Amino acid sequence: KISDLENKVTVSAICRRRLPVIMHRLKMAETIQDAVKFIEQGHVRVGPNLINDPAYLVTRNMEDYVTWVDNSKIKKTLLRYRNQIDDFDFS
């Protein structure tokens, strides 16, 4: 799309790159109301480094690697409910 960037890129798309709504579309949380609680508690990394500010825009080439850190309570209880908690690599 070349000249019709006048009409589509709006608030509902430029906020769709946000880490809470990308988290909710990745189904890592129930809703935004506790997705912001998780990524403010500092459980969620993207790439290699942890990210804490809940206004971050995950880019195109980083949406694939926005995953929970090792050694965290939510990763531990996820692997516990799936009952696959391979406890060699910390969790």
Binding site: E40, Q41, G42, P48, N49, L50, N61, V69, D89, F90
Partner: protein
């Protein structure tokens, strides 16, 4: 062996504060960031002070004896330093905000702009010992209505001019016994008065305003007191006065405006001597020499520094740092210059013997990633996020190839084989390893193989294998030459960053994301060992946190690794403020350095009761200098070592004393004296016996030297011959040494590698330059005599 002091600071040549010359013009000292730096402008060198304020630095000076500096931060943490030996001396806290400090010209007293008041203190002494409470407050003055914006001292120690943001410029006497002389308050300027200076004969007082007014107060008639005899105007259009100074001994007033311009005047007639402009961003501070010749400027927005000789209108140094960017570095494999590559998108080529940016390279649009030299260090490469990698040489200082993918994809790392033919680069969002031929700037192959994004590359130096490493937890040994393209994967436990390779080409060190270092053999694929490094790095408690200060895995990994050229020590740094260095055969930390203490930087300390954040992105060892560079958020950090004060000998016993060495020297057993001093391994004794060996037996001693002190002797002769003067004596020593023991180092190539780099960059940096200069002198003589032109 790991006595790494913090020696230099390349990059960010001035950040914030007021540049000051020394008592003479030889040493220019500047308020860089947290610390300060000192540039020796005649014996052209640089160092950076070892102390560190707790916040950003705000005002510097040293007294007129040149033996005592005080720096003072943005809040009142005064550091007082004995200047002539770089020891921190006293740690005072003034109680509130400081604006500018100024030593009196005699050195007894100093004065301080504490907001609306004015502080007057007497200094402690430097000849007597360390006191406890050394600051005696002399007097405060509280006559203003708003904050003081600057101070100037009289030539004698009797009067100060306090110029403020309230429109008064007030003259204040230093002692109350003669207070009835002049406590007056010159008003009159339209808006803020930003300077006030005495003349040489202290009967005329100039005051310079914000809008560009210069008022000449004089004591004439209409008892009769302080009228205004002359008014001058600067007539900049919308450029108010941003900084001023006035050297009285030659009547020179330097005024820098708020639009990058500065003018400078011969004041009592007010003629415009010289007017020019630095940039589109305001010059923040000025300073003069004691003798009027040198004249230095500091612009704070871009962070650049000028010095100026205005008799013959020429400069001595003209540097410019960056604004909060240093993304990678690389040495040269002859360790004489260092490329840094800055996240604003530009390359700088510093030289470590100087401290000067001898070259910018402004080509890239977007951010830069990494740099990498090849072929002894006169061809370098640079990879951007713009979508290309590109070559440069360091002879012509120009591009010659711009390698690109046909897809507009950014890159993250790159490397280049030693036989300077192929160049590999590693991207982020097409999962591949591209290789280009550097002979013809085409894409050779899209060398795929991974499942995810690659993060760090290296070519070897003995077989030139590639060792890629990617976030699929996999490193990947590639052999791309000779009909094969052999692949071999090695699989690490966790995610992978930060590869480096040992310079003998037998093993490869890799960091992980699970806070570990591993080393892998590459003719095999088994490990050797893993150094666990997730308990010995202290990341900082952010100001944007709910969690604790230690358990949060913020930067509990190592974003960059490098080996050392002997092969044992590994230096490693991450996004946290801890530089570690280890050795491989014992898997223990040699040392851990905190990099900075700026609480302006957010994640710095551990117990703080968006933001700039402390980070270290690339660390490398020197090929010869026995220093290592870090590329922090501040700039280049140079931790150097020495053969000095650490007394680390090598198998001494009861009889070997420096007295015994010098008596064996005077009894002329020169080889026994040399080994008797090298067993001791002390700096002055080695230098003394090495100079005092005469010339007619250099073959005898260099032939009958042992076979175990030879790398130490070669390393010392190189690192003394770089900054020595006796170049024919050094060349005689090296000729005798590698004529008598030439085959042995060739059969023991690797443990002489950090010495044979030194005496080869001793030759190609000073000796070959001197020899081609006398070559040109011989040829110009031979021409000017052999031909005949009589017009």
């Amino acid at each position: 062996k790991s006595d790494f002091k913090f020696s230099n600071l390349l990059g960010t040549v001035y950040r914030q504060g007021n540049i000051t010359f020394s008592d003479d013009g030889k040493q220019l000292l500047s308020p860089v960031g947290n610390r300060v730096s000192v540039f020796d402008l005649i014996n052209n060198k640089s160092f950076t002070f070892e102390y560190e304020h707790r916040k950003n630095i705000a005002a510097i000076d040293l007294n007129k004896q040149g033996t005592l500096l005080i720096s003072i931060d943005e809040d009142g943490r005064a550091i007082l330093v004995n200047f002539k030996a770089r020891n921190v001396l006293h740690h005072f806290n003034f109680k509130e905000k400081c604006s500018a400090v100024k030593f009196s010209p005699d050195g007894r007293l100093f004065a301080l702009a504490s907001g609306r008041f004015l502080q007057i203190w007497k200094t402690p002494d430097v000849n007597k010992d360390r006191q406890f409470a050394p600051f005696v407050r002399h007097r405060v003055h509280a006559g203003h209505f708003q904050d003081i914006t600057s101070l100037t001292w009289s030539q004698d120690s009797r009067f100060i001019l306090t110029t403020s943001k309230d429109l008064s410029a007030k003259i204040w006497s230093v002692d109350s016994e003669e207070k009835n002389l002049a406590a007056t308050t010159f008003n009159g300027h339209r808006d803020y008065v930003m300077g006030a200076f005495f003349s040489h004969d202290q009967e005329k007082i100039y005051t310079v305003s914000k809008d560009g007014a210069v008022f000449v107060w004089e004591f004439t008639k209409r008892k009769y007191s302080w009228r205004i005899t002359k008014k001058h105007f600067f007539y900049a259009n919308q450029a108010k006065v941003k900084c001023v100074t006035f050297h009285p001994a030659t009547r020179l007033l330097a005024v820098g405006f708020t639009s990058g311009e500065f003018r400078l005047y011969d004041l009592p007639d007010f003629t415009l001597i010289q007017q020019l402009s630095m940039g589109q961003n305001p010059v923040n501070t000025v300073s003069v020499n004691q003798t009027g010749e040198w004249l230095a400027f500091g612009s704070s927005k871009l962070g650049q520094l000028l010095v100026y000789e205005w008799q013959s209108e020429s400069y001595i140094l003209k540097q410019q740092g960056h604004f909060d960017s240093t993304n990678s570095l690389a040495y040269s494999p002859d360790g004489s210059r260092v490329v840094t590559a800055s996240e604003d998108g530009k390359i700088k080529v510093w030289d470590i013997t100087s401290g000067f940016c001898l070259a910018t390279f402004e080509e890239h649009t977007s951010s830069v990633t990494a740099v990498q030299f090849a072929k002894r260090g006169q061809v370098m490469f640079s990879s951007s996020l713009d979508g290309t990698v590109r070559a440069w040489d360091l002879i012509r200082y120009r591009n010659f190839r711009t390698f690109t993918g046909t897809e507009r994809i950014q890159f993250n790392c790159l490397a280049v084989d030693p036989s300077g033919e192929v160049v590999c680069a590693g991207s982020l969002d097409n999962f591949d390893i591209h290789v280009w031929s550097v002979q013809t700037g085409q894409l050779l192959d899209a060398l795929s193989g991974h499942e995810g994004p690659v993060s760090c590359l290296s070519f070897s130096q003995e077989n030139s294998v590639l060792a890629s490493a990617s976030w699929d937890k996999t490193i990947r040994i590639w052999s791309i030459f000779g009909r094969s393209q052999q692949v071999e994967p090695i699989e690490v436990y966790s995610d992978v960053l930060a590869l480096s390779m040992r310079p003998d080409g037998k093993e490869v060190a890799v960091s992980t994301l699970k806070g570990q270092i591993s080393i892998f053999n590459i003719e095999d694929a088994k490990q050797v060992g893993n150094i666990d490094c997730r308990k010995d790095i202290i990341s900082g408690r952010f100001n944007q946190d709910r969690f604790t200060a230690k358990n949060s895995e913020r930067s509990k990994f190592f974003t960059t690794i490098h080996y050392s050229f002997d092969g044992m020590a590994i230096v490693a740094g991450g996004n946290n403020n801890s530089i570690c260095l280890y050795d491989v055969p014992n898997e223990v930390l040699l040392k851990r350095f905190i990099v900075s203490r700026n609480m302006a930087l957010n994640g710095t300390l551990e117990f703080l009761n968006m933001r700039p954040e402390v980070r270290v992105t690339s660390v490398q060892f020197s090929p010869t200098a026995n220093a290592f560079a870090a590329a922090s958020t501040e700039g280049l950090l140079i931790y150097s070592t020495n053969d000095t004060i650490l007394f680390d000998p090598f198998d001494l016993d009861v009889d070997v004393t420096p007295h015994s060495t010098v008596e064996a020297l005077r009894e002329k057993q020169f080889l026994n004296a040399l080994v008797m001093a090298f067993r001791l391994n002390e700096e002055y004794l080695i230098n003394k016996v090495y100079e005092a060996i005469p010339i007619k037996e250099i073959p005898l001693v260099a032939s009958n030297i042992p076979a175990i002190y030879l790398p130490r002797i070669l390393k010392f002769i190189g690192d003394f011959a770089i900054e020595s003067q006796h170049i024919e004596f050094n060349l005689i020593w090296i000729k005798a040494l590698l004529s008598a023991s030439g085959g042995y180092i060739n059969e023991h190539k690797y443990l002489f590698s950090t010495a044979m780099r030194s005496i080869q960059r001793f030759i190609v940096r000073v000796a070959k330059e001197v020899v081609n200069t006398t070559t040109d002198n011989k040829y110009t003589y031979r021409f000017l005599v052999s031909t005949d032109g009589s017009m």
